[PDB]
Amino acid sequence: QVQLVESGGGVVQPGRSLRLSCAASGFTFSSIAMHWVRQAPGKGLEWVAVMSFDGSIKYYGDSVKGRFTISRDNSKSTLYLQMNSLRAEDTAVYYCARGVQGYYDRSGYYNLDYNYGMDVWGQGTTVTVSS
Amino acid sequence: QSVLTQPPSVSGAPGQRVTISCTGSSSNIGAGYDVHWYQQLPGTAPKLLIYGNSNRPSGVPDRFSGSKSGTSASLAITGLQAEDEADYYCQSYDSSLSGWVFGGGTKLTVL
Amino acid sequence: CPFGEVFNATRFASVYAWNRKRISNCVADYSVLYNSASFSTFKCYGVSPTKLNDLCFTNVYADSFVIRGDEVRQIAPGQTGKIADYNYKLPDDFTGCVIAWNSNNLDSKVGGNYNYRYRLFRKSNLKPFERDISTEFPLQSYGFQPTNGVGYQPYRVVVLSFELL
Ligand SMILES: *[C@@H]1O[C@H](CO)[C@@H](O)[C@H](O)[C@H]1NC(C)=O
Incomplete structure (x- = not known):
């Protein structure tokens, strides 16, 4: 029954904004981290944004460092990627990917798991930006 | 463009053993993080194929195996069928940029 | 203790x-x-x-x-x-x-002794914390050179x- 539902993509004037969503049902959403990854059409995949188990630890990729912001909603079990000031390269198709349930720690310091991939992938949304 | 440099297009005759090489840096693979492997059919979203450099989830056959020694990893298809024409991406985690890096993606098709 | x-x-x-x-x-x-x-x-x-x-x-x-x-x-x-x-x-x-x-x-x-064993073939994959010591040939050794x-x-x-x- 596990599946990710995505919605929020379409055509966007470059400079006014858009906010992506990613639903999740069939597992526990408030235990597993979540990743955002994208693909310009034809080229290779790329990593965009992560949010931790609760929302305390965030990391970002080099090309979305600053114009992209991730935030998840555990009340209705939904992940959101907020993007503003789109560019000519960011025309891409966007996947939210289930991370790992690892919230491992030795000597107290809770930290994300950096050895596991991205297990189950949704069909994702596409965005199209052009002046 | 990417961080991991894998060959852009490899292919072979059916019934053979094709290895999709994927070499990396001294900051991500040589650090110790594990190269995973993905399978992207044309027009679909990629699914996990091999994690932890050698494991395999339930659903993939025992044909796709892996390896990692030093700063190099490689998938290995054995006895490929016609239903494997997808794209294959090697994913690791970088410690310098603190981010998960991908590969260029290798176009595999039957012959 | x-x-x-x-x-x-x-x-x-x-x-x-x-x-x-x-x-x-x-x-x-x-x-x-x-x-x-x-x-x-x-x-x-x-x-x-x-x-x-x-x-x-x-x-x-x-x-x-x-x-x-x-x-x-x-x-x-x-x-x-x-x-x-x-x-x-x-x-x-x-x-x-x-x-x-x-x-x-x-x-x-x-x-490279072959004393260790792991099960390969089993119908009805396990629930959490399930042992199955049965043998009817599902096991295989490792080899540890x-x-x-x-x-x-x-x-x-x-x-x-x-x-x-
Ligand atoms: C168990 O082995 C470790 C290995 O260094 C040792 O430090 C520890 O004292 C051992 N436990 C005993 C002897 O009860």
Whole structure:
């Protein structure tokens, strides 16, 4: 029954904004981290944004460092990627990917798991930006 | 463009053993993080194929195996069928940029 | 008191029939096991060490076995494979501490002894914490030559598990 539902993509004037969503049902959403990854059409995949188990630890990729912001909603079990000031390269198709349930720690310091991939992938949304 | 440099297009005759090489840096693979492997059919979203450099989830056959020694990893298809024409991406985690890096993606098709 | 033995035992049973050991009404040290550099993975999932001294845990479990090297990435929660699917599967809301250390000079003979076993063929994949010692040929050995890869070398991994009254 596990599946990710995505919605929020379409055509966007470059400079006014858009906010992506990613639903999740069939597992526990408030235990597993979540990743955002994208693909310009034809080229290779790329990593965009992560949010931790609760929302305390965030990391970002080099090309979305600053114009992209991730935030998840555990009340209705939904992940959101907020993007503003789109560019000519960011025309891409966007996947939210289930991370790992690892919230491992030795000597107290809770930290994300950096050895596991991205297990189950949704069909994702596409965005199209052009002046 | 990417961080991991894998060959852009490899292919072979059916019934053979094709290895999709994927070499990396001294900051991500040589650090110790594990190269995973993905399978992207044309027009679909990629699914996990091999994690932890050698494991395999339930659903993939025992044909796709892996390896990692030093700063190099490689998938290995054995006895490929016609239903494997997808794209294959090697994913690791970088410690310098603190981010998960991908590969260029290798176009595999039957012959 | 309780688990000075299970981390320094001389013979770990295989993953196809692991040996859970419960401990009750003893003192809980929980400090000789951490701050030791000989452990490779020290993933703890529910509760954290250095705050693990609330002795309300009754019947603390300790499952111990031996898996090959890069299959200790199957003893996380979730993580389907052929070790968390047919041999030994952790629950999804797991609050424990999976500990794995290397075995250079202990399990790998120069001949590469075939004493260890892991199950390959099984219908109806396991529920959490399910042993199946049955043999009707589903098992297969490893082979542990000391010039194997670092990923093909046995990791004597032991899992702690807690519960309450
Ligand atoms: C178990 O082995 C470790 C390995 O260094 C050692 O430090 C510890 O004292 C041993 N436990 C005993 C002897 O009870």
